[PDB]
């Protein structure tokens, strides 16, 4: 592939890799360095020793996020290990900087055991304003995030778990609005039991969907209570009463399909029997469960969102984590909690309803967007997102009492 | 001067809090740019590294990235203030790496005082970094931690507080001996102070040709003599001496070299008066030297003095060591910084000071004249020749000793 070669050269050329650490202050003279280092640097140390909160005033902590991975689930490459994941973590860090102005240290950790990983990461707390866990396989990632959120007094957030849920939650909110639907009666079917599956269900319920209206499926079919095969602690929580056992049966009359599976997992027949104006999230990648065209060919009333920037309504994680961490950092929050995640969902949804500015159109080739079936969420390169979402997260942090700065 | 304290606080909070920023070294504005820096293009270097682990040095910042890691248990001269309070110092250390060797640094402050917790945490960070500079960890824990991490990790691990003073003072000593026509094997050295850098000084001096029988270590309790128990440990005894002397005053009679790692005033004119002809004094107490060059010259006109102060000639400044040492180790993709490499740095620093000083250096220092002798025993910190002289010799020592994985 010529594109793979372009990517290798991109990384290899010039300064190897994609990041550089620079000084934000003058550091060229004896005088400069008498402040940046000994003896002047003793002064902020002594201030922080006396008043711990001042670490946020004299260091980069308040704008510094760790992107931390053990490389056990890198993109779609699987368990390739910490060093091979480093380009991805450097790149995630680039997204933080470009979209939120947040500085990132990417940390690749050679630990696969949950408790070993956690015991190594938790003692890094003094360094960072927040932790973005990335590309850790399930189920370890559930246990790791849960334990670090309890042990650490700074935000801990696994974006692979929650980003899809937050952004698709906002799209689902708008899709329901457009089709005169109330969340408490919407029937949702989730296909796939990966890292982001459960979080989708939790966010949808937080948006007012009912637990009984959600059916989760995996490779073996419907996850029903009593099922034992392929089961575990996490699949068990959202296990359903439904008499359905296959995805085909679960989808009959369903309103929403959340696809976190493989291409072709959604067929015209399943589509045939969904409720009118079906809402389809085809998040499998590289290839969606079904293309927008093949979907509308079978059901012209179908509303569709995918993980791809080729098609309308791209569910892109970059719409979530930059603003969420920006709001958390700005309030020096000790957590990113469900209230802050929900605030991001509603803000994203509300932004899509606004008029789309000229330069957004300009950015996307003169294409005109207006709120509807073809425009349910903001575009990823819409610069309004940070301005719209981060303050709502900040407000939610203050309201829920996890903010430590007004 | 608490108004100088004020200047430093302002410096740290002006514009952006802190002293560091992380930026992209490549285009990252457009969707096309980001299709290379992130999904899907970023999969290509990932797959290459998975097939061949060494390619992590080709496609990431690892080969120019050092961690400055501390638990804040011995920050500068402030003692055990903890990891958050040490963060400005570690950010500052990283600034020195970048300005003097072009090395990128992630400063990592670790909330762990238990040796096992600390080492377990740092060991598994190897995939991230090309090298580890331990900093501001108190003794004796720092000894256990550095030895363990050097053994356990396959990237260089180096505790600059232990070794920097030793390397730079060793270079100065070599040159001081040259000037006074001494042979290292017969030089009598007294080390005053038993902190993190004391033993490493003794080891480097012996590597330079000094003898144990000629070295006497002192502390709070006076001389550390063999057979002493009072306030001893597994590190103090390693250099205990058969001397009949018990106080610092006694130790210094007829001695050639005083190595001061203690407190101000610890060296008085009386004991200076009874040192050998051409006494060599390293007064490296922070912030005020055991004695100033001027009062040392008063008590003893034939005295040769180095201090930790940029104020006085012959500054024993750690910045002469670690930037080049890591530069040499990184560029050869070495698995260690070993004693051979440390020695190579010593000899390179010493040799550089013997050369004619270029106009460029004089101009940097306001037009002052420098020539090898009693007032110029080691290179100036802002001499750009230092990296050019030291890093290649470190690299050659890495290759010669077999720890390099990449030839230069
Ligand atoms: Mg990921
Ligand atoms: Mg230090």
Numbering used by the authors:
A (entry chain A): 16 to 421
B (entry chain B): 15 to 422
Quote the authors verbatim.
Bacterial hybrid malic enzymes (MaeB grouping, multidomain) catalyse the transformation of malate to pyruvate, and are a major contributor to cellular reducing power and carbon flux. Distinct from other malic enzyme subtypes, the hybrid enzymes are regulated by acetyl-CoA, a molecular indicator of the metabolic state of the cell. The larger ME isoforms (hybrid enzymes) are predicted to be a fusion of two unrelated enzymes; a catalytic N-terminal ME subunit and a C-terminal phosphotransacetylase (PTA) domain. The PTA domain is homologous to PTA enzymes (that interconvert acetyl-CoA and phosphate to CoA and acetyl phosphate), yet they appear to lack critical catalytic residues and thus acts as a sensor instead.
We solved the crystal structure, to 1.67 Å, of the first 434 amino acids of MaeB, corresponding to the N-terminal catalytic domain (MaeBME). Structurally, MaeBME closely resembles the fold of small prokaryotic MEs, which form a tightly interacting dimer where the catalytic site is composed of residues from both protomers. Dimerisation in solution was confirmed by size-exclusion chromatography. MaeBME can be divided into three subdomains: region d1 which contains a Rossmann-like fold that forms the nucleotide binding site; region d2 which is mixed α/β and contains an N-terminal extension that sits over the dimer interface and extends into the opposing monomer; and a small “hook-like” subdomain (residues 369–386) that has no structural equivalent in other characterised ME folds and is best-described as a projecting loop with central alpha helix. Comparatively, the hook region is easily discerned as an insert in the primary sequence of hybrid MEs, and packs against d1 via several conserved hydrophobic residues. Each of these catalytic residues is in an equivalent pose to those from the eukaryotic enzymes, with the difference that Y52 is contributed from the other monomer rather than on the same chain. Our truncated ME construct (MaeBME) retained activity, but was insensitive to inhibition by acetyl-CoA, CoA and acetyl phosphate, confirming that these allosteric inhibitors act at the appended PTA domain.
